[PDB]
Amino acid sequence: DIRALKTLV
Protein backbone atom coordinates (compact mmCIF):
# COMPACT_ATOMS: atom_id res chain seq x y z
CA ASP A 1 0.00 0.00 0.00
CA ILE A 2 2.49 2.77 1.22
CA ARG A 3 5.53 3.08 -1.18
CA ALA A 4 5.93 6.63 -2.80
CA LEU A 5 2.75 8.45 -4.17
CA LYS A 6 0.21 5.94 -5.71
CA THR A 7 -2.01 7.11 -8.70
CA LEU A 8 -3.69 4.18 -10.75
CA VAL A 9 -3.71 0.79 -8.73
From Swiss-Prot:
Subcellular localization(s) per the UniProt record: Cell membrane; Membrane raft; Mitochondrion outer membrane; Cell projection, Axon
Tissue specificity note? Widely expressed, with highest levels in fetal and adult brain. Expression levels of isoform 2 and isoform 3 are much lower than those of isoform 1.
Tell me what turns on expression of this protein: Up-regulated by endocannabinoid anandamide.
Q: Which family does it belong to?
A: Belongs to the G-protein coupled receptor 1 family.
* Pathological association: Obesity: A condition characterized by an increase of body weight beyond the limitation of skeletal and physical requirements, as the result of excessive accumulation of body fat. Dysfunction of the endogenous cannabinoid system including CNR1 has been implicated in the pathogenesis of a number of central nervous system disorders, including Huntington disease, Parkinson disease, and Alzheimer disease. In post-mortem brains from Huntington disease patients, a progressive CNR1 loss has been observed in the caudate nucleus, putamen, and substantia nigra pars reticulata, and altered expression and abnormal endocannabinoid levels precede motor symptoms in a disease mouse model.
Subunit notes for this chain? Answer: Interacts (via C-terminus) with CNRIP1; this interaction attenuates constitutive, but not agonist-dependent, inhibition of voltage-gated Ca(2+) channels in neurons. Associates with G protein alpha subunits, including G(i) alpha-1/GNAI1, G(i) alpha-3/GNAI3 and G(o)-alpha/GNAO1; palmitoylation is important for interaction with GNAI3 and GNAO1.
Q: What else is known?
A: High-fat diet also increases the hepatic levels of CNR1 ligand anandamide, but not that of 2-arachidonoylglycerol.
**Primary role:** G-protein coupled receptor for endogenous cannabinoids (eCBs), including N-arachidonoylethanolamide (also called anandamide or AEA) and 2-arachidonoylglycerol (2-AG), as well as phytocannabinoids, such as delta(9)-tetrahydrocannabinol (THC). Mediates many cannabinoid-induced effects, acting, among others, on food intake, memory loss, gastrointestinal motility, catalepsy, ambulatory activity, anxiety, chronic pain. Signaling typically involves reduction in cyclic AMP.
What is the protein name stated in its UniProt record? Cannabinoid receptor 1
Organism annotation: Homo sapiens (Human)
- Underlying gene: CNR1
Q: Which residues of the full protein are shown?
A: 338 to 346 of 472
